[PDB]
Subunit: 264 residues, 4 copies
């Protein structure tokens, strides 16, 4: 039988590239989305056309809030994402924690608050609950029926040790996700679940600024003097999920073109 990957925030950009990369290796893919229903469903369509019954889409707000049905908690919503894989395909072999909100939370001058739950939920708390659910399902599976290549990838940030000015909550949340990578790798090793991180520097940079400014930022990357393509990140995620990487756990791989080696 065919292995299953759950990719959060899979609709576009890096998540899509990760979903596509995994699909190209033969994985059936559960495509999580929050607001990008159209893009997610379009991606599912493409993948199901190449290979029937190889893609589904699930909607979830991964912010640390209760939602409307008692109210539904984030944990419950995370458990149902993993469950959707089991209900549809009877398994979940790979989890990619990719979904992530990203915007300023300045230290210096119902916003703020919202911001805390959105940024911490998507980047840190939801990944925790998702890993918990993922692990619970593997533990609950009889050893003889388990998959042979369980892999969890956390999308971190190569640059957060050189924090982006005004992005504290985001930076804090990636710090937490790094901790989750290490703690989960240790605790889930007995179940042969590998937990690793991939950290982009600058990838698929949006040109929503003066062209010369866009160019200024990307030119700072020592290698190629440009931001990465989506595939340049996703191919690494795909390798780490492959059985050739089966001795790697608890580690974060920078995919940053040497950007973290720079100084002001």
């Amino acid at each position: 039988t065919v292995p299953v990957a759950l990719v959060t925030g899979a609709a576009k950009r890096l998540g899509r590239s990760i979903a596509e990369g995994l699909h190209a290796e033969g994985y059936a893919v559960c495509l999580h989305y929050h607001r990008s229903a159209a893009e997610a469903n379009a991606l599912s369509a493409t993948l199901n056309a190449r290979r029937p019954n190889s893609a589904i889409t699930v909607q979830a707000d991964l912010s640390n809030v209760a939602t409307a049905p008692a109210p539904v908690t984030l944990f419950t919503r995370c458990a149902e994402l993993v469950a959707a894989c089991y209900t549809h395909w009877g398994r979940c072999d790979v989890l990619v924690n990719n979904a992530s909100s990203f915007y300023p939370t300045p230290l210096l001058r119902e916003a703020m608050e919202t911001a805390t739950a959105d940024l911490f939920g998507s980047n840190a708390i939801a990944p925790y609950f998702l890993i918990k659910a993922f692990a619970h399902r593997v533990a609950g599976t009889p050893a003889k029926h388990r998959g042979t290549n369980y892999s969890i990838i956390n999308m971190v940030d190569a640059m957060t040790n050189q924090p982006l000015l005004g992005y504290t909550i985001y930076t804090m949340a990636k710090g937490a996700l790094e901790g989750l990578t290490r703690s989960a790798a240790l605790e889930l090793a007995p179940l042969q679940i590998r937990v690793n991180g991939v950290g982009p520097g600058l990838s698929v940079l949006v040109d929503d600024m003066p062209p010369a400014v866009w160019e200024g930022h990307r030119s700072k990357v020592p290698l190629y003097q440009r931001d990465s393509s989506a595939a340049e990140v996703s191919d690494v995620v795909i390798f780490l999920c492959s059985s050739k990487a089966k001795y790697i756990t608890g580690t974060c791989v920078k995919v940053d073109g040497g950007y973290s080696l720079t100084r002001a």
Copy 2:
């Protein structure tokens, strides 16, 4: 003329030693507590006896939850009022030590878990963020000519979290976040000359609620002295980092672990 330090979770153990260490250097100290009212008030008494009007106590749950007042009171508001208490009482707040911290297992493998999330993440990460925000807002709001000359924020982190304690995921995640806060705040608050640094104990003031051989077993693994640290062995470092001699240090984490993080299984 007397500088003011806010120390969270100041009632006992490391927080108390930090409060005492800062007080010994001339600081007036605002002693935060959650459940340890007796201990906090006793400590305040001792310090006020040595030096009148050099200690106060404030109560606050630093968990990421709304509390009862009218509208519910958010964590952010509660954090702001901690900083405000220093300004109301002494007209200043020069040092913040994010020490308060909950610490217990949140296993990945087999109502509870949810209060756990808000308690562990609130105390270790979210409250420090809001506390730093409030601290910084008050400095920015103070006219340059009236500002203190040695602003210092110390976050109590963990020297061992890169070698995670089995079953302590949320706690470990939260310290990870606090490390991020240290670095991000240091960069952003540098223009205001607010230094933000971390102190990371390994094993300190270990309590023996286990067979003696097991207790001795844990402490013997520390390469230096084969023992856990005293409270002062940690707090003295916090105090140095707050001193003006350490005024070029910001955004860094100092391990106080007797070489424990150098070990392997």
Copy 3:
């Protein structure tokens, strides 16, 4: 056909790296110091699979002068890179794998130990990288390869130092520095410089059981496959980074 230079290629991890690269279509220059038999045997196997796809070169990578004026380590390193160019006209990949490893205790010979441990693990890699880079720079842009990659074999565990191994540990620390410095300086020439750090691999029960994942040391392939990936064009945005291949061993504490 692209060319890889693998130092200490005769056995264990170096052999697995040489084999892994060869399986991807690389011609491979197999460096050895004392293991002539093993190196030549490996060359034979590879040349049998694919004619003219393997050669062997001998060099002491210790920081000493050797007999011919005496020959310096730098010269010896330059000749290793040169051997690739003389034979195949190119050198696309360099894997700094050769490494001596033994106690240099601080608490109760020592001088050859310093030159051996520091030379193989740090100084020779530096000279090798220098020579490698010089040859790429000297090649006209239109004739250059499209996937230049240098991999340094580091150690996942050296931040948790092995008791009594100071010089070795120092040397890996230097090799890590080399990885970062070289990655930055050679970026304009599109030469990627990265590190792979094993924890416990191909151990010659108590020790291996401490590895959280699988409770065993790794196989050679479990390390070499990662080296091979980093050399592939799919990894072309990775430079200046070290990848631990340690089954979570560096996450442990006493």
Copy 4:
């Protein structure tokens, strides 16, 4: 009883500040120098004037080369530095590995040049510290327990910025990486003898406007005292639970990005 500190490259700048800081705490200080005899001797004079017999000077090339007397090896020269403390004062409590050469060794465009460069940069920054630590430890081990000092401390002067390497400075950067490894390895091995081994890493200090303005805190390089005071604290008994750690003294400079 008067404790003794050996400070390498003690003649000027940070080393001098470290020597002065330690002396101000009551230490007798052995001032190592290579080429700066005048400055070293002038510093010794000042310190001996404040407190008779509290300073001496010793000359040594800490480069990884043999010198003229059989030729004298670096190891021997390092052992004699530690020995000089014992001969003069009967003890050596603190070692500060401060001496360091620092200049470009470019990977991209004189063969003898590059070779003395290797031995000079690696010797001073890494190999000599190793031998110095070895000698230092040997002397403590050889001292009967009842006669040992109570606050043994070795400080290695590292670099806060080497993870963001200075372009063209490979050998130097490699050597600091080695010194970091030495700090960690020595801390572990020498823990049983209660010898603490730590690192201090400046970012930009006592620079000889564009460069200094990049430091987030104060937008300037540090003073010598802003670094040396930290070295002094780490050697104090209040820091006696700190070992195997590197303290950045960089005004947040390592937090920056291009």
